[model samples]
Structures are given as structure tokens and as C-alpha cells.
Target: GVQVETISPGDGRTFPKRGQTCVVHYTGMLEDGKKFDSSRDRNKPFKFMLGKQEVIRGWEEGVAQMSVGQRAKLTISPDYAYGATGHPGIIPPHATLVFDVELLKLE
Candidate 1:
């Protein structure tokens, strides 16, 4: 499961549904604030197919709960994240991930 806290709420007009493309800007880090990856760092927003397991479980659930223009902080437990088999060279085993995420668009 993932925990979400709003840093800034959205315009509240539109929310992404299943099968839509979710475009976002996100920065991910470990519990100790060690950054692992960032869409912003690449100067490009990321896009993924919602509900398709295109990303992690935490993101599938968390991003679905967001609206366009929303910004939130998500605390993703290992069970819903990389888990014991974390991403090699980036995430350590059993790591709890933190993400500062912005929902940019839905298509």
C-alpha cells in the first residue's frame, strides 16, 4: 500500500481513469532521502499507461488517485514498491520509497 499527502491540491476538474496515459513529473528517493531517479532531472515528464502495471504498484494506485494539476507526496511501502528485489544499482532491497509527484496531464 501507499500513503499520500497533498503538498498542493489540483484544480479538481479532471482525474485520470484506467487505460489513460498519465503524464507526470516525479522524483524518487529512499527513506534516508537518497535520490534514486527523477523525471525532472531528465527535463522530461514521464508517461505511462494507467492500470497496465507499467510502473510499480504504488504508482498504479497512487497516480490513479490524483487529478490533473495535482502535486502530492507519496510514501510507498516496500510491499507496494520495489520490495525485496529492488531495482539493481538504484534501489536497495526492502527500501521504502518516497516520491514528490505532480500529475501533469491525462490522455
Candidate 2:
């Protein structure tokens, strides 16, 4: 089962809501230590709406539990992430994903 671990919790009562906008910094990789993507490398954060289809289901589920400025590590099973149909050239099919995610802001 996939579990979201709060490495460093945030200090705010404000949590994400569906359809609301959010910004986060993330490093995504496979369990084998292969990198899939990173927001820090792009010099910009990723912005999306909560519960929107802008991201994978693992992200949607994981981010929903975070507060602004909170950082966490999440282990996502294929079922919650890319699943059998993974991203071409980035993620392998049926691969498990690990992420270090920080909720940067909500806009």
C-alpha cells in the first residue's frame, strides 16, 4: 500500500481543496534510483489545481494531505500513479514511484 510520509510538517490550518490552485516543488524518481522528473531543475515550481486531472492520482491524493510549506516523501504504488500505462521516456511501465514533495504555495 502507498503511504504518504510527512517528513517536515507545515504550520497552517489551510489545507488544499478540490478545484483550488496549488504550487509545489517535487523530485520524482523510481525505486531503482532513476529520476523521472524534478521541478527544482526547471527553476520553477509546478502549479495545479487540487483534485484536478493535471497530475497523477498519487500526487492528487498525496498533495491533498499537505499544508503550505510542508514537505513530505510519498511512496506511490503503480496503481495510484502511472500504473501499467506509464509516461514514455520518463517512467517505465508498472513502476513504483517515490517523491520528495514540498507544498510551496497555494494560488
Candidate 3:
């Protein structure tokens, strides 16, 4: 499971449906605060289907709970992230990940 802490309540009026595409900006960090990936740095928002497996389990679950314009901190366990076999050269094996995620849109 993912540990979710709200940073900003956001609009609070709009939630995405399961089949809708979600757009977000995120900064990924290790438990020790080392960054791995960031949509902010790239100056681009990430888009993925809400119930699709295009992203990790933590991302799918955490982002699905977000409201449009919401910002949250998600602390994800390995089992919910990359698991024992982490993303090679990017994430470590069995690593716990943290993300500052902002839900930008639902389409």
C-alpha cells in the first residue's frame, strides 16, 4: 500500500473516473531524499490512464485518489513500486520510494 499525505487540498470538486486519462507532475525520490525522476524538471506533465498499468502500482493507486489540482506526498513501499527487482539503473532493488505528485488534469 501507499502512504498518502495531502500537501494541498486542491479544487476538491473533480475526481477522475477509472477509464479517464490522468495528467500529473511528479518528483520521485528515494527514502533518503535522492531524486530519481521528475516531470517538473522536464517541464512536462505525465499522462496515463487511471486504471491502466502504464505506471507502477503505487502511482496507479495514489493518483487515482487525487482530485484535479490536488498535490500529495506519496510514500510507497517496494511491493507497490518497483518491488524486489527495481527499475535497473534508476531505482534500487526493494527500495521504498517517495513522490511529490500534483494532479493537473483528467481527460
| Highest-lDDT candidate | 1
User: Which parts of model 1 have CA positions greater than 4 angstroms off?
Assistant: none
Candidate 2 ranges beyond 4 A from true positions: none
Cα lDDT listed for each candidate:
0.92, 0.86, 0.91
Worst 10 residues of 2 by lDDT: 1-10
What tens digits encode model 1's per-residue C-alpha lDDT throughout 1-107?
89989999998779889899999999999888888889999999999999899799999999888889999999999999988999998888898899999999988
- Descending-TM-score candidate ranking: 1, 3, 2
TM-score of each: 0.95, 0.91, 0.95
Among residues 3 or more apart in sequence or in different chains, the pairs in candidate 3 whose N, CA or C atoms overlap within 3 Å are: none
TM-score for candidate 2, please give it. 0.91
Q: Which regions of candidate 3 are displaced past 4 Å?
A: none
- What ranking emerges by lDDT with the best candidate at the front? 1, 3, 2
Query: What is the alpha-carbon lDDT for the whole of candidate 2?
Result: 0.86
lDDT (10s digit) by residue, model 3, range 32-70: 889988999999999999887888999888887789889
Q: What lDDT does model 1 reach?
A: 0.92
